[PDB]
Structure formats: structure tokens, C-alpha cells
Design a protein around this nucleic acid. Structure first.
Length: 414
DNA sequence: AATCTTTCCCACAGT
DNA sequence: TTACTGTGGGAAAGA
């Protein structure tokens, strides 16, 4: 039968933390296909397997007699209904795989959907079903123009940047940090924070408009580009006088501030600067290189982390709970902690460090638990003598551990 | 009338 | 050459 997590096994986990993590990276918007069209999601949704637990799991399975294909994690992806209209992803040799041929027909009437990722090992042992964040279905890019918060880009949020032509032999390329440099990758795409700057030269809020100075920061490596002025393009000109909101899937260019019309530009797989030509017709326009035209789109991320605290289990690890936030109560006579998040179940207990707490399930989004007494952690303490911080972890009845990034602090009373 | 969003159509450059 | 395929741009339709 399945075993409950022991205090010792929790201690061992807390010491090492070899979690298995599934990340799903995708755009927040998808353009619908009309008729027999296939307009593929771009950038292509990406599944990443993160953490040292994938290697540990793989070694455990092979020691127990699995071959390499049997221990290989497998993934299928689709857009959230029936059927095995799900497309296979190849994760062999890679950390990750992109879903390059997903689309949504106009016969689908949903205004929003989630990607569904189904995972199992090559021996057919179920891992489970992992959901993306919400994706809004759009008809096509505008323009021009804010009341539609969903179609605008807020300062501090993440964007992908890709470079297309209508038809080319060469692969669509995506801004992606790799090998210690910004590159225009055919295989992976980065998500960049887009920071609006005080254009004097720090954080400034609100939505991004053409003609504003922004900083692009890789959400993964923290690498940053120089100050850029984001400008609007149509066909092959950057419009110098546009100042309307930047919107989903619009073409734009990045003029390197204080430069003699140099723009961020791709060259094969390299990111360079290229000089625009001044345009004799009208002076409020500059002709740009095709490598200097980028499509911008807001990006999101679903992340699930799990660990077999008591060894292999027969139930899938999913639905994986995610804790958004922690709220202290008091309240009743008991010190209570409220957890808000997703995928909660009555088979979960909140653990404070290596101490299991009485936990009350309310719904998939809410749980309460009894804050252990400080002596719990500090033997003989009859009150909080100095601050004590402990990790908060969710644990399932079969010993699977769902780590949280959150802690709880006991603070001395003033 | 006017303006905006959705759907439909076509042509490009690659198979 | 003709036939077929995603994609951007622009026309037509619907709101």
C-alpha cells in the first residue's frame, strides 16, 4: 500500500531538494485560423523539464530494470478538449521541446483556452496532465490603439520577439539568450521583461507606447540589451512619429537610443545593429532591414514542481497544487494560516519544515491549516524568543511533495 | 455617416 | 512548368 511521508523523509528532502519541474512557456494570445487555414501558434509553446529529479528518477528506473526508452519522459500536447488530436513532443536528448504545429480553427467557439500537456515515461507509467495558463483567441492584429487591456503590453511584463518573412527557407528566428550572447534562434525563444524607462536617465509603470524608451531583460539569464526606442513598422519602414499603444502581434523595431539610426537587427543567428536609410519621400519614416522588423507578443508561464518523498507512486503526480500566497489569521483562538492557489485536494497536508499541520480543505483554491506551536521547532520555548523562519510545503497522502517558494516566520511579540 | 472588428481573399516564396 | 502550403497584407463584410 502507499505510505505517508515520514518526518525523516521530509528532513532528507529539505536537505537536497531534487524536485522534478515541468514548465510550459507560451504566448498569452493566439490568432485564429479561418477556413482550411493553419496559422500555427508563434512562438511555439515550449515544454521544459527542469530540476535534478529528472536525472535521479531516470537512474532509479534503470536500476530497477528499465531500458533507456522506458525511462525516457514523453509528452503530448493539445488545446484542451478531445481527442488524441494531441501532437507528440520529442524530449530525447533535450531538456525541452517546442510545439510547432498547433492552431485553432474559427469553428472552435471558445474565447479562451489552455494547452493541455500529457506526460508519461516510455514504459507507459503515468506522470500526469499539466495545464498552461490562459490563452486569449484573437482574430488578427489591429491597428491602431487601450480599453482592451488584453491587447496592450504593460511595463514590467514579458514579451517574445520573433522575425519572419511571409515565405523563407530559413527558420523563423526568436530573440533568445544562449552561449553568453543574444542570438536570433531557430529553435528556442526567450521571454523578456519590457521595462518602460523615465526617458531622462528606474521603474516606470503603465502600458508601452511607440516612441518610448524600453529595456529588454531576459527572464531566464537576466541579460539586458541597451536602451531601445520601440517604433512601429509597416512593411519596411519604421514610423518615427507613431506614439499609440504597442499591441499584440504588431510589427515593431528597436532603435538603439542616441545612435545614428542603428536598429537591433538579426544576421543569420547573430544579433547586430543595422543602419536605417533616411527615406527621401517623407522625413518621419526610415527604411529598415528585414532583419530589423520584429513581431512582439505577451508571454506567460505555468510551472509545476513535484517530488516522490516516499519513492515511486502509482497515482499520477498531477493535479500539481500551486500556492499563490500566504495569509496569517487570528481570528479564532487558534493561529491559522490561509493558503490561496490552485489544484488543492483533501488528500493534502501543509507541512511547516518537518512538522505536519492539521489542514482543512475548503476548495481547489483555498486551504486552512493550524500554525504549529513554536516548540515544534525550538524545544522548550514557551513563546517566540527570536525569529524563526520555516519552509511551507504541500504533501500528498502517498508521500509526494509539492514544494512552495514560501516560508513562514515566527516573530517575537513586541 | 463613420468607424471598428471579424472574416475572406490573394499573392509571395518555398515544397 | 502545375499544384500545394503558411503567412502577411489588404479587401470585404458585419457590427
Amino acid at each position: 500500500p502507499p505510505k505517508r511521508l515520514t518526518r525523516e523523509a521530509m528532513r532528507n528532502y529539505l536537505k537536497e531538494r531534487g524536485d522534478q519541474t515541468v514548465l510550459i512557456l507560451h504566448a498569452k494570445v493566439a490568432q485564429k485560423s479561418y477556413g482550411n487555414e493553419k496559422r500555427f501558434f508563434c512562438p511555439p509553446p515550449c515544454v521544459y523539464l527542469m530540476g535534478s529529479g529528472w536525472k535521479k528518477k531516470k537512474e532509479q528506473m534503470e536500476r530497477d530494470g528499465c531500458s533507456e526508452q522506458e525511462s525516457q519522459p514523453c509528452a503530448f500536447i493539445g488545446i484542451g478538449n478531445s481527442d488524441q488530436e494531441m501532437q507528440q513532443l520529442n524530449l530525447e536528448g533535450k531538456n525541452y521541446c517546442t510545439a510547432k504545429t498547433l492552431y485553432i480553427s474559427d469553428s472552435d467557439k471558445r474565447k479562451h483556452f489552455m494547452l493541455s500537456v500529457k506526460m508519461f515515461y516510455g514504459n507507459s507509467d503515468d506522470i500526469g496532465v499539466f495545464l498552461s495558463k490562459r490563452i486569449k483567441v484573437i482574430s488578427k492584429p489591429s491597428k491602431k490603439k487601450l480599453k482592451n487591456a488584453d491587447l496592450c503590453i504593460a511595463s514590467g511584463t514579458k514579451v517574445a520577439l520573433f522575425n519572419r518573412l511571409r515565405s523563407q527557407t530559413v527558420s523563423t528566428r526568436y530573440l533568445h539568450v544562449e552561449g553568453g550572447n543574444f542570438h536570433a534562434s531557430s529553435q528556442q525563444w526567450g521571454a523578456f521583461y519590457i521595462h518602460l524607462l523615465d526617458d531622462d536617465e528606474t521603474v516606470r509603470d503603465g502600458y508601452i507606447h511607440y516612441g518610448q524608451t524600453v529595456k529588454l531583460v531576459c527572464s531566464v539569464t537576466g541579460m539586458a540589451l541597451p536602451r531601445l526606442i520601440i517604433r512601429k513598422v509597416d512593411k519596411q519602414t519604421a514610423l518615427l512619429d507613431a506614439d499609440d499603444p504597442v499591441s499584440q502581434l504588431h510589427k515593431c523595431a528597436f532603435y538603439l537610443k542616441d545612435t545614428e539610426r542603428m536598429y537591433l537587427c538579426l544576421s543569420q543567428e547573430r544579433i547586430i545593429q543595422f543602419q536605417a536609410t533616411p527615406c527621401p519621400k517623407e522625413q518621419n519614416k526610415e527604411m529598415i532591414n528585414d532583419g530589423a522588423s520584429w513581431t512582439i507578443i505577451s508571454t506567460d508561464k505555468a510551472e509545476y514542481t513535484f517530488y516522490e518523498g516516499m519513492g515511486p507512486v502509482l497515482a499520477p503526480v498531477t493535479p500539481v497544487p500551486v500556492v499563490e500566497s500566504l495569509q496569517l489569521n487570528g481570528g479564532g483562538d487558534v493561529a491559522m494560516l490561509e493558503l490561496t492557489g490552485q489544484n488543492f485536494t483533501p488528500n493534502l497536508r501543509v507541512w511547516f519544515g518537518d512538522v505536519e499541520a492539521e489542514t482543512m480543505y475548503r476548495c481547489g483554491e483555498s486551504m486552512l491549516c493550524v500554525v504549529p506551536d513554536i516548540s515544534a521547532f525550538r524545544e522548550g520555548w514557551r513563546w517566540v524568543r527570536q525569529p524563526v523562519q520555516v519552509p511551507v510545503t504541500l504533501v500528498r497522502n502517498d508521500g509526494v511533495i509539492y514544494s512552495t517558494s514560501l516560508t513562514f516566520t515566527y516573530t517575537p511579540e513586541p
